[PDB]
Amino acid sequence: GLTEEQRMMIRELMDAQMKTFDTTFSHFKNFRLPGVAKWSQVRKDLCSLKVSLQLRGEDGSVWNYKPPADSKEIFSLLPHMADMSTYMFKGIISFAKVISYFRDLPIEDQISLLKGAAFELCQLRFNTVFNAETGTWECGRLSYCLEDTGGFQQLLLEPMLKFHYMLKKLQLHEEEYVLMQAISLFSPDRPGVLQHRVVDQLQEQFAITLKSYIECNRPQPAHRFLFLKIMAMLTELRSINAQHTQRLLRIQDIHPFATPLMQELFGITG
Numbered sequence: 001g002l003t004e005e006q007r008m009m010i011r012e013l014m015d016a017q018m019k020t021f022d023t024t025f026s027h028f029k030n031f032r033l034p035g036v037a038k039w040s041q042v043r044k045d046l047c048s049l050k051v052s053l054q055l056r057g058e059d060g061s062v063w064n065y066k067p068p069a070d071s072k073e074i075f076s077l078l079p080h081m082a083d084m085s086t087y088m089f090k091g092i093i094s095f096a097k098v099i100s101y102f103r104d105l106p107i108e109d110q111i112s113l114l115k116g117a118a119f120e121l122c123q124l125r126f127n128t129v130f131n132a133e134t135g136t137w138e139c140g141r142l143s144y145c146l147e148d149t150g151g152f153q154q155l156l157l158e159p160m161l162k163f164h165y166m167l168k169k170l171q172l173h174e175e176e177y178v179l180m181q182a183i184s185l186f187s188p189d190r191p192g193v194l195q196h197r198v199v200d201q202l203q204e205q206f207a208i209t210l211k212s213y214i215e216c217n218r219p220q221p222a223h224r225f226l227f228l229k230i231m232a233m234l235t236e237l238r239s240i241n242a243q244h245t246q247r248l249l250r251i252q253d254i255h256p257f258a259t260p261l262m263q264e265l266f267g268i269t270g
């Protein structure tokens, strides 16, 4: 059984998630769409996550976008992805700002923790709209469908994609997703945090709550070691976070595309 501090911790996380996660993406509107030496590495960076895009209209109409082969056609999806990222990041920032453990930290550590974890919280939220049968992220009227590559194996060669399939296969509850979000957010070892002991104590408590929730609610033999599998996924997710930071920075060096909010989050000055 969870203690009262633990049940309350979960309720506060769950409430923050309910208030700040637009699961139907109803408020993502007026976003950009693809028009009607270092460069070899940028080519490698871009052609590794090909998605077609689908856009269903309230009236029943469907728009469908198929991406181009690398033959600057590589950049055609970046403004849209920047708008989607920005929308998600806003959701993430709101999430952090309504959690009491987060509001109570000094404002500089708030900033440092948000810059450390925005990508990871974004991937965690996206996993809950990921469909592993069809290979697609179902974001309300938007859909992002993985392109036929190689097969599912070759898709699993990409770390973001292997992470999404492997995280989906664990069939987490909402509680577990939200606790994963808090553990990743309260990482005491992000560049520029000052209250590292406070943040470490909070993280330890989130982790223990999660282990206890699993121990109380998931007895079936398939859930043995579930807690440790989740912590290994968070470790993997930090690895992915760092690779993607460098990926983004390279692309940004060649082809400016980041929004003001992304510039802030990734430490770009102007």
Ligand SMILES: CC(C)(C)c1nc(-c2cccc(NS(=O)(=O)c3cc(F)ccc3F)c2F)c(-c2ccnc(CCS(C)(=O)=O)n2)s1
Residues within 6 Å of the ligand: 046, 047, 049, 050, 051, 077, 078, 081, 082, 084, 085, 119, 122, 123, 126, 137, 144, 244, 245, 247, 248, 262
């Ligand atoms: C599920 C789905 C399909 C919606 C995706 N989500 C993400 C995702 C997840 C978390 C954060 C960000 N944002 S981000 O960290 O700022 C960022 C980093 C970066 F390296 C490049 C652009 C960025 F915006 C994301 F974009 C995707 C992603 C990841 C990496 N690269 C690309 C380009 C794909 S493309 C143009 O088709 O080649 N897209 S795909």
